[PDB]
Symmetry: C2
Subunit: 152 residues, 2 copies
Amino acid sequence: KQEDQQDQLLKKVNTYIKDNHLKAQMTAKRDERGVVLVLQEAVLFDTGEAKVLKNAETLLHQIAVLLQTIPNDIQVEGHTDSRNISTYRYPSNWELSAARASGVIQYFTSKEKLPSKRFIAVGYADTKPVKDNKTNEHMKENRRVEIVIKKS
Amino acid sequence: DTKKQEDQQDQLLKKVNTYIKDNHLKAQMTAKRDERGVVLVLQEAVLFDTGEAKVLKNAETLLHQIAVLLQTIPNDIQVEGHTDSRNISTYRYPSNWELSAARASGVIQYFTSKEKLPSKRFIAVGYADTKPVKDNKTNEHMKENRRVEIVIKKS
């Protein structure tokens, strides 16, 4: 059923995306990790920052409403492009990617009250690009947060 | 299958423990094995000052000695940050999720930017206070919860 369970979870997620008119804010897919929600950087953060935008709070609440209806563990993954960052607040792409996953989880737990034990923050820096970083188009899609719904 | 792979993990842990003994590192790190793989445990005070995620200069010798050991094996590495239940809300770290993740990231950045270990071998992981060693009732238990674990993943 792990095969059927994964299909049924992905259909439930895609049904939630459609019923809530969220297609332009997020996509959903399945891979070896489980069912993954992909959010581009622009719907969550400013450039080079990890603070959840105020206009992102409605989207994250809508995701949290879906997440409360399932028991699976959640892994929030942060990613950067290969562009160098080196500020006081984010001394490398490792810190930036991990701070973005952390900011999403802090929203889910502190303000939507989902149980903290359901979450793990993961930072990949630029080690998992979609394709590459040779163009501005390609670097843009690498700046993304992925919410992994693990197998249960 | 597993017995071939668990006996392999047994030999890796023995190698790690021997590396710790031979380099006089017992007071600065321990090693263990569990379902994740072979894990190096470093208490926060050998890496960071209180409430910060910047690697201390005096930790760089230990991280170099760890990097030399990691260069001899191909395994993927997961660096895990852990906090206690003490709340933090500063400019650089709005909460324990951020602090734990930044501490894992600072260790990895040193490995990749200073020791030349390939970035593709690492992932940074933050657990906040969701994985204590025992509890957060006493000062000694809260202290041991503030730790970094370097997980040598299976092959």
